[PDB]
Design a protein around this nucleic acid. Structure first.
Ligand SMILES: [Mg+2]
Ligand SMILES: [Mg+2]
Ligand SMILES: [Mg+2]
Ligand SMILES: [Mg+2]
Ligand SMILES: [Mg+2]
Ligand SMILES: [Mg+2]
Ligand SMILES: [Mg+2]
Ligand SMILES: [Mg+2]
Ligand SMILES: [Mg+2]
Ligand SMILES: [Mg+2]
Ligand SMILES: [Mg+2]
Ligand SMILES: [Mg+2]
Ligand SMILES: [Mg+2]
Ligand SMILES: [Mg+2]
Ligand SMILES: [Mg+2]
Ligand SMILES: [Mg+2]
Ligand SMILES: [Mg+2]
Ligand SMILES: [Mg+2]
Ligand SMILES: [Mg+2]
Lengths: 79, 85, 157, 120
RNA sequence: ACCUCGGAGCAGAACCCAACCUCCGAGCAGUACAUGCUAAGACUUCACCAGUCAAAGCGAACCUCAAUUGAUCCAAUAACUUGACCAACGGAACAAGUUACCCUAGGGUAUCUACUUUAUUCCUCCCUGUACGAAAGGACAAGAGAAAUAAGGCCUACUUCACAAAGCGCCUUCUAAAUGAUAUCAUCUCAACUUAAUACCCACACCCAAGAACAGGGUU
RNA sequence: UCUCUUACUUUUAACCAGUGAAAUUGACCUGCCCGUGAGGCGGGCAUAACACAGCAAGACGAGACCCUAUGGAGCU
RNA sequence: GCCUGGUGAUAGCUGGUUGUCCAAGAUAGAAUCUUAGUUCAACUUUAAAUUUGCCCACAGAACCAAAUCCCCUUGUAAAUUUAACUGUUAGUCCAAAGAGGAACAGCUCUUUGGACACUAGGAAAAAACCUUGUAGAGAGAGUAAAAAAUUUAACACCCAUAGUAGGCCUAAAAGCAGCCACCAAUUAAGAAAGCGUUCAAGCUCAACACCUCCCAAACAUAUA
RNA sequence: GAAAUUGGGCGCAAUAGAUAUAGUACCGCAAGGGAAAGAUGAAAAAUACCAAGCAUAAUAUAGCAAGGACUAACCCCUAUACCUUCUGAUGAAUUAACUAGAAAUAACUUUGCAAGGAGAGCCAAAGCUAAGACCCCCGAAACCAGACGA
């Protein structure tokens, strides 16, 4: 058995108030659904062509002579 | 006590925006200003991308309504120019 | 445990918090409201007819008797054309002011019975009342003149 | 069974009392929302976890701008118990390329495009 | 009792969903002999295996039912084909009972703490055969007794015994009235007012009624 | 044997001297009550440290009983 | 029997598997001499290729509730395919819809979703409830969840004659053993609502006249 | 599962390596089982510091024995031992030493050469050759053969 304090009721209530104002601001969209249609299709398509393009541009890196020869320096000495 | 600070338009946490966290902490004793704080550079980058997003979304909304008005005007022109001959 | 049980099932704690937050709150006014602000005409016609009937009236405290004793008093006054009337003084207090009886307003309270008359056998009624050591004669009023009990001795004699 | 909850449309129809309560106009409404996650997606169904990831609200107490269009409003209606929504109001204009760096979104909900750190 | 297959509910509205859960069924029959041959595209019992549907085409005419079933190998057959209540129904080519004699692998000499000297009852008798009752009846209380048990001691006798320890022996055991408001009577008052632990203990060596050791008592 | 046990002797014991095992052992600086799911966790309470002798309430410690193995063995 | 060998017998069973650091990672099932196990799938992992995936709006999905399927926009960033393999599965509890049971079980069996086998804070302790997640240092700050509230039961003071001991049945049963009417007198008391008597007589009610040892300590007063 | 046919040490170094200092001591009636261990120096005709366990040096209210700390060891505050088996009892006195992942079909990565590769055999519709990279320890009752035993 667990009982409900005043803290719990006041907390619950302030969450209910935030919720009610969320209900208010979702009650008046700037556009209708007919107006919004395809208003951002270009930017979505370009974004996915970027995802697609980074996916299909995956390949091993370049190998260099300077790195392989630069391993010879492990026996660089003084004279 | 941060609900008061929300009443006054301040950040709810005094470590938010405003003069305590955004002025530089130190200067040179000559009066040369310090190089900027790392967190302030980061934060200005966040605010700038936020502002760019506000501008970008606003412009897509406006272009959206303008394109819709062209589709409605051209539908009505296709109504009136097909009631003839 | 099933959804229907025999005992009242323990709620989930947010269920219980919902139930407590959404309790009924009654309205409270600013000021408490409690701290703010046929037989009757049968008696009026009947006893008002008795007002115009009688020339002489008397009255007593006729509560101090038994049933058969009030039957004896009823028969011994039935021997006369006097009448006895048990009726509420509740209506008789507006009766007196209707009949212009200002000296009779301080007369009719508590247990009383009318002895309305036109012929005085009230001396012989006193002769019946002298054998019983109680039940006094309350003052009457013959023809808008008041009778004290001394006046009942004088007029009755 | 616990399922996904439809919410009727009468819930999202303002009354003039509510226009007196909050600061809204039914004619000429606002363009941009500010959405902030103020509740956890833990102990919430997986669909709400997903919608929080789509809207870009993985970190709590961090504001995000959205469009006030019915698609975004549909996603917001799914997770309206986890978030907070306020209109993005703009006292001065939207920021030009001159004022692009020197902005600050204040607590009130307004986005000021000149953010000095001097007192008035 | 069951083991495979199908229908319905569970599982209300795409699909899926268990139970030694609730109810029905199946292990065929009938007709046709183009129930010929081919072939796009699909579905699919949550895998696989199996299952299903199928346009166009060539060739001809001018299937019902829900389930109505069985892999591989092997046989039989010139060939086409055929072969299990393999029902434990994904089927080992052919193998029962029992073991309290069962067996194996598995599953369900005190170290520490604590501790080691915190008066009841029965019967008798009296008061009294009074109170009370009205006769029958018949008190309490307090007192004397005798017992018994428990508790604490002790050895004068008795008994086991004998510089002593014992018991079968003895000793001791200390809520109810008036008054009275709310509610002028009354009223017991979750009304107020008034009235009805002492005792106990406390500063070398040798012998001891003290003692496991240590301690203690005595040593004039 | 028991009501109902008592005394004594020996042994054992305990102390002193010599000699000197074993089962056991996660670490321990090893309390009580209630509660939880109990030396150790929660709430209370308690609480200088240290041997020696006892006690056996608790801590810590085989024989059964059931099931399983596409595990054995025996008997008919 | 015991010894040596086969023999490192075999064990779907028990027990055990040794440096560092980072990363990704948990719950459909089908067959099986099978339910202490395996195989396939599902889920998981890496690498690779590509192109859509997820969220979804109208329209749409059958006769005899919550929802789902489908799905452009939009918000996002993933998905499918190819290659290669391991491992995991009686999950538990809570919320909801149910089945079996006793509308018992920390009981058994499904479904949807959470959480736990991953962190921290709270709820007394506390796998599964609430808050909360992505990792470091700080003797900074704002918050989230988060403290059980109750205390009861007075009641109307009176006032009662008469047709009548209402008829019938009943020894008589009278307002009160039963049937039927239930009128009436004074100002007004029912041919009677409870005690009560074989029956009576007596008592009230309506109505008349006044109206094993409890278990934080505690505390009702200072501005949220 | 054929055939024709073809043609000294990137060892061990006294718990290791042999069981081996020895098949001795010991155990068994017997067949048979079967150990352990040594360390000077050129000359013996030259006699340090380090495991556990203790001792130097017993102990002081309180509690997985620490951590945050702190002027201060304790006192204050926080803190349900580790392994393993389960969705969430087992084993361990302590120290030292010993004691448990063995396979390159296919795929991948890196070279060589490339319509060919390979030091015959084999593969090849970009292949082939070479390398790298993957697969544990202990434990029955038993069964069989041959001995040794009354
Ligand atoms: Mg399928
Ligand atoms: Mg079978
Ligand atoms: Mg089968
Ligand atoms: Mg000794
Ligand atoms: Mg306990
Ligand atoms: Mg313990
Ligand atoms: Mg002891
Ligand atoms: Mg076998
Ligand atoms: Mg083995
Ligand atoms: Mg096995
Ligand atoms: Mg990770
Ligand atoms: Mg089988
Ligand atoms: Mg198995
Ligand atoms: Mg689509
Ligand atoms: Mg050896
Ligand atoms: Mg040492
Ligand atoms: Mg402590
Ligand atoms: Mg380990
Ligand atoms: Mg012999």
């Amino acid at each position: 058995p667990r009982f409900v304090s005043l803290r719990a009721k006041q907390n619950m209530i302030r969450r209910l108030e935030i919720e009610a104002e969320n209900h208010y601001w979702l009650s008046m969209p700037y556009m209708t659904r007919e107006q919004e249609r395809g208003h951002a299709a270009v930017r979505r398509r370009e974004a996915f062509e970027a995802i697609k393009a980074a996916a299909t541009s995956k390949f091993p890196p370049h190998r260099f002579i300077a790195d392989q020869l630069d391993h010879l320096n492990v026996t660089k000495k003084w004279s | 006590g941060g609900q008061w600070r929300l009443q006054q338009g301040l950040a709810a946490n005094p470590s938010g925006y405003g003069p305590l966290t955004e002025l530089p902490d130190w200067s040179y004793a000559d009066g040369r200003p310090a190089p900027p704080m790392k967190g302030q550079l980061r934060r200005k980058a966040e605010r700038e991308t936020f502002a760019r997003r506000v501008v970008l979304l606003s412009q897509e909304m406006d272009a959206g309504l303008q394109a819709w008005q062209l589709r409605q005007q051209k539908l009505q022109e296709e109504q009136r120019k097909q009631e003839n001959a | 445990s099933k959804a229907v049980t025999r005992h009242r099932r323990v709620m989930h704690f947010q269920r219980q918090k919902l139930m407590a937050v959404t309790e009924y709150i009654p309205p409270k006014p600013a000021i408490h409201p409690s701290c703010l602000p046929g037989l009757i005409r049968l008696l009026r016609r009947e006893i008002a007819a008795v007002f115009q009937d009688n020339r002489m009236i008397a009255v007593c405290q006729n509560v101090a008797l038994s049933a058969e004793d009030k039957l004896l008093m009823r028969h011994q006054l039935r021997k006369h054309k006097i009448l006895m009337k048990v009726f509420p003084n509740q209506v008789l207090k507006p009766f007196l002011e209707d009949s212009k009886y200002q000296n009779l307003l301080p007369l009719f309270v508590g247990h009383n019975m009318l002895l309305v008359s036109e012929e005085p056998k009230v001396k012989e009624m006193v002769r019946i009342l002298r054998t019983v050591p109680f039940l006094p004669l309350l003052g009457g009023c013959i023809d808008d003149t008041i009778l004290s009990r001394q006046g009942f001795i004088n007029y009755s004699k | 069974k616990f399922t996904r909850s439809r919410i009727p449309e009468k819930v999202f129809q303002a009354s003039p009392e509510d226009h007196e309560k909050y600061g809204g106009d039914p004619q000429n409404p606002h363009k941009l929302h500010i959405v902030t996650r103020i509740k956890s997606t833990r102990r919430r169904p997986y669909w709400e976890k997903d919608i929080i990831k789509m809207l870009g609200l993985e970190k709590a107490h961090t504001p995000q701008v959205h469009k006030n269009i019915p698609s975004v409003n549909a996603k917001l209606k799914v997770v309206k118990h986890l978030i907070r929504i306020k209109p993005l109001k703009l006292p001065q204009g939207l920021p030009a390329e001159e004022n692009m760096s020197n902005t600050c979104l204040k607590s009130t909900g307004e986005l000021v495009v000149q953010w000095h750190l001097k007192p008035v």
